[PDB]
Design a protein around this ligand. Structure first.
Ligand SMILES: O=C(O)[C@H]1O[C@@H](O[C@H]2[C@H](O)[C@H](O)[C@H](O)O[C@H]2C(=O)O)[C@@H](O)[C@@H](O)[C@@H]1O
Ligand SMILES: [Ca+2]
Length: 489
């Protein structure tokens, strides 16, 4: 082939554990097709039985026996830290000399290059580059609203009334108090409910990210607004308005709850969430899960805190043990060219899509499957958090009119908050970040869960919590973040 990266066939080892559920599979249709076109085959070495992606990275790193490539989600920080320590190689020269598609991408997307550049000026990974503007929105059961003679809730107080009616007034009509008013695939979304009481949960699509307010770097979990907001979330959890299993249910939450007519509301991505209307129309007559404007919060605003993050802190890196870095960067580059981008987005031609009227078009068997197309793509090795360039066209093809109405409502009415795009730490500032932040973040999540579940009272533990943050070096992290912000802006 002319797309061939190397003349002699090459096999590389990739450690890629992602989203706590998936590993790289060389038997994937997409992986097979990429191997054929590039003459480079990636063989997975990650533990498929394991269910903690970050831990698997840690074990691999601690063992000292590195593969050739490491990929996965939420590895940006680890790519940078172990890049500077020499476990991953800088890609700057390799890109410049061997990677025209990446060069042309970075030229036209300077902001992405900046986002993946380490404090030493080196690029240690290639990112998952999403395509699109909005991500998540609120969805509510319109059929339940109508059946209970309720108007769409406009404020937090009105929402409380609605969710209470969902819980107590038997909208599925089976005589049981089985309804769960608010559900979510993502446990972290329970924290986002503090938005209703004028508190942030994250600055970006990255969970528990910092934000900027009036020239000051802040972290959502350290703010007194969070203390007051999480108190309310705890109350709603105690009242059973929030899924008792919100921390545990996870991936198939929508299929379980909406699919069995017990879920009333969620906060999730427009396309896949709205697809549930098509999937459940026969099973649950009248089922209508519609986008809802965010309620007016206690600060008098309608917040959509989440948006697409370009790029994501996801991707892959070349190890120092890799004896074929030139061949590897050319493989990496393939994904940003026309054929590579097509495959990594749409799957395999003849299997999952066809070129029709000069464009990749999903087969009817894919579009009418009543299973979200992104899920379908994962199964065959597409839409995975490698270094690749998402093409929104893939998503447009399975975004229905209900999803479109929601997307357009959110764009036009300006609900989406300005996103935190990070600060440029020096190497010295980064040392403090890498040292303290991971353990602080873990502590924050665990305290957050405790407050929500009612095992700890936020009001009674706040002062000791703050002291613990100090002891764990959180405010040392805040100092370097603010210093970096002051330099950059
Ligand atoms: O579900 C959708 O409509 C969109 O999902 C996006 O994926 C994100 C989602 O949280 C997934 O469950 C997984 O965690 O990956 C997330 C991500 O890639 O940021 C995209 O697949 C988007 O194209 C879908 O339309
Ligand atoms: Ca019921």
């Amino acid at each position: 082939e002319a797309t061939w990266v190397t003349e002699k066939p090459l096999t590389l080892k990739i450690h890629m554990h992602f989203r706590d559920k998936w590993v790289w599979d060389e038997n994937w249709p997409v992986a097979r097709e990429v191997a054929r076109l590039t003459n480079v085959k990636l063989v997975g070495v990650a533990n498929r039985a394991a269910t903690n992606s970050q831990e698997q990275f840690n074990l691999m790193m601690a063992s000292g026996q590195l593969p050739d490539i490491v990929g996965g989600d939420n590895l940006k920080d680890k790519f940078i830290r172990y890049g500077m320590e020499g476990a991953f190689i800088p890609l700057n020269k390799l890109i410049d000399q061997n990677a025209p598609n990446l060069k042309a991408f970075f030229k036209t997307h300077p902001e992405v290059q900046r986002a993946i550049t380490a404090p030493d000026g080196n690029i240690y990974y290639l990112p998952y580059v999403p395509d699109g503007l909005v991500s998540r929105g609120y969805f509510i059961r319109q059929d339940w609203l109508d059946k209970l003679h309720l108007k769409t809730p406009q404020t937090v107080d009105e929402l409380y009334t609605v969710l209470k009616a969902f819980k107590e007034k038997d909208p599925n009509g089976n005589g049981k108090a089985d309804e769960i008013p608010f559900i979510n695939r993502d446990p972290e979304e329970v924290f986002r409910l503090v938005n209703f009481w004028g508190a942030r949960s994250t600055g970006s699509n990255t969970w528990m990210d910092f934000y900027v307010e009036n020239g000051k770097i802040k972290h959502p979990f350290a703010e007194v607004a969070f203390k007051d907001g999480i108190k309310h979330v705890a109350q709603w959890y105690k009242e059973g308005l929030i899924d008792p299993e919100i921390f545990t249910r996870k991936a198939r939450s929508r299929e379980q709850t909406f699919g069995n007519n017990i879920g009333g509301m969620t906060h999730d991505w427009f396309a896949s969430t709205a697809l549930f209307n098509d999937a459940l129309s026969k099973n649950i007559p009248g089922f209508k899960l519609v986008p809802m404007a965010p309620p007016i919060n206690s600060k008098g605003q309608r917040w959509e805190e989440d948006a697409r993050q370009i790029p994501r802190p996801d991707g892959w890196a070349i190890t120092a043990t890799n004896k074929n870095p030139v061949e590897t960067i050319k493989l990496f580059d393939f994904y940003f060219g026309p054929k590579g981008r097509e495959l990594s987005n749409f799957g395999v031609p003849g299997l999952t899509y066809d070129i029709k009227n000069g464009k990749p078009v999903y087969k009817d068997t894919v579009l009418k499957a009543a299973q979200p197309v992104n899920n379908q793509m994962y199964d065959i090795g597409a839409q995975i958090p490698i270094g690749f360039w998402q093409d929104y066209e893939y998503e447009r093809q399975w975004t229905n009119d209900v999803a479109l109405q929601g997307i357009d409502m959110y764009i036009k009415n300006k609900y989406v908050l300005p996103q935190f795009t990070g600060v440029n730490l020096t190497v010295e500032e980064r040392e403090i970040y890498d040292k303290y932040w991971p353990d602080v973040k873990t502590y924050m999540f665990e305290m957050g869960q405790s407050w929500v579940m009612g095992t700890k009272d936020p009001e009674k533990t706040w002062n000791d919590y703050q002291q613990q943050l100090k002891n764990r070096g959180f405010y040392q992290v805040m100092i370097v973040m603010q210093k970096a912000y002051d330099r950059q802006y």
